């Protein structure tokens, strides 16, 4: 295998190169929001990001070594986690706002337009605030997102041992970045821990949002693409 022989510097480069583009939303900003429109914007966006997430996943070292069925399971398990950590990252330098896209920057109070949404916004905003107080770096972000891809579904499965080897390499890469940034050993271990404990909160937010998305589908507040229904269906 070829992902097990990458260097720390080369793991970063490969992740930085695999990054998806930042997509714009269709939103016409001359008109205000309804509950149906906002939700349509969110799901339309997510549906387009999902296509590029598949391309990005295939470029994550070691992912391409897994069976097609295993790749499917991992992406089904983690897809909304991946979208949310994306969201939280780009919202990092906009305190109080979620940057869904460059032309869709939503205040905390705009989550009230959709029933049950503001609770989700609040958790997203507190995670972004956390990123900001840690001063999360781009190189660290691409490592965390990759970890989510490989970790979240790994226990719901040789296939497992390869993933855990690739995960160890990514741990090595995170530590390498912190050792390069001048952190002491004790500070490296502490930061590594702090960063990974955020993945617990991101899991919580995905689980909550999967439920909200389900409710919005049942109540029929908005039509969902076939791809999105399928990713939603995998969790139930």
């Amino acid at each position: 295998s070829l992902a097990l022989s990458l260097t720390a510097d080369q793991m970063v480069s490969a992740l930085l190169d695999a990054e998806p583009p930042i997509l714009y939303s269709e939103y016409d900003p001359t008109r205000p929001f309804s509950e149906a429109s906002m939700m349509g914007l969110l799901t339309n966006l997510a549906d387009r990001e999902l296509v590029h997430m598949i391309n990005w996943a295939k470029r994550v070292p070691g992912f391409v070594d897994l069976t097609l069925h295993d790749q499917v399971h991992l992406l089904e398990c983690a897809w909304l986690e991946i979208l949310m950590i994306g969201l939280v990252w780009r919202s990092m330098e906009h305190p109080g706002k979620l940057l869904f896209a460059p032309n869709l920057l939503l205040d905390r109070n705009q989550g009230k337009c959709v029933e049950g949404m503001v609770e989700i916004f609040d958790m997203l905003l507190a995670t972004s605030s956390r990123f900001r107080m840690m001063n999360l770096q781009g190189e660290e972000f691409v490592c965390l997102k990759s970890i989510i891809l490989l970790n979240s579904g790994v226990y719901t499965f040789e296939e497992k041992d390869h993933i855990h080897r690739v995960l160890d390499k990514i741990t090595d890469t995170l530590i390498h970045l912190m050792a390069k940034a001048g952190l002491t050993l004790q500070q490296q271990h502490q930061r590594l821990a702090q960063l990974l404990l955020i993945l617990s909160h991101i899991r919580h937010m995905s689980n909550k949002g999967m439920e909200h998305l389900y409710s919005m589908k049942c109540k029929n507040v908005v039509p969902l693409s076939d791809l999105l229904l399928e990713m939603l269906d995998a969790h139930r």
Partner: peptide
């Protein structure tokens, strides 16, 4: 049998 994800992956 024909999940969209499946066919998006094997491209």
């Amino acid at each position: 049998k024909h999940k969209i994800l499946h066919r998006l992956l094997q491209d």
